């Protein structure tokens, strides 16, 4: 809101035009556009790397497992969703070697606990594809051991370093308030993310 100029925002939207895929059929076009605008706050260096790797951010109008490429996850219990009685059929956002996201489910509490669905999922793709699983490196493990319970959801974020990475990334990039909150709660994580983007 003062840290990225109009030219850089437009460049990031242009990069995202070669990443984001809108679904076939009816969907909420305004909310899909809002998701793209939130994604455009991610540092352009990461967006450029996603584009070069041909990573697509698939926006969906239905359940993830109703897509042919995720049908294999029907009935599978996601990591961290044990005991919920729920499976991938119920999950609104996926990230890793692909990214798939239900339009309308961005906000925290819409079937998931992330501060923002699309930034959290895209962070997983950046971790895995762009940064070669940096969340599982020794350096990040040590930061996670200290700070990984300081964003809440201790049995998920505090247990899986890749989840703490993805959520911290989402705080860093969503808006000025979540960025400030991360700096206060998780100062080593904040510095780690700042240095990754240098």
């Amino acid at each position: 809101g003062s840290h990225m100029d109009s030219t850089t925002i437009q460049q990031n939207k242009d990069t995202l035009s070669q990443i984001v895929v809108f679904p076939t059929g009816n969907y909420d076009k305004n909310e899909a556009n809002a998701m793209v605008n939130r994604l455009a706050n991610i540092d352009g260096k990461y967006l450029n790397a996603l584009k070069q790797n041909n990573l697509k951010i698939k926006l969906l109008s239905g359940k993830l497992t109703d897509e042919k490429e995720y049908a294999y996850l029907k009935g599978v219990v996601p990591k961290g969703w044990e005991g919920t009685g729920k499976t991938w059929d119920d999950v609104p956002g996926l990230g890793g070697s692909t990214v798939a996201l239900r339009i309308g489910f961005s906000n925290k509490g819409k079937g998931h606990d992330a501060i923002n669905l699309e930034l959290h999922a895209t962070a997983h793709a950046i971790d895995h594809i762009v940064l070669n699983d940096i969340s599982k490196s020794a350096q990040f493990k040590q930061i996670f051991a200290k700070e990984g319970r300081s964003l809440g959801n201790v049995n998920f974020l505090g247990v899986y370093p890749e989840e703490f990475f993805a959520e911290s990334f989402a705080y860093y990039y969503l808006n000025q308030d979540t960025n400030s909150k991360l700096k206060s709660a998780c100062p080593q994580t904040y510095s780690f993310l700042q240095n990754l983007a240098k």
Partner: peptide, 4 residues
């Protein structure tokens, strides 16, 4: 790789 997949993650919720």
């Amino acid at each position: 790789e997949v993650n919720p």
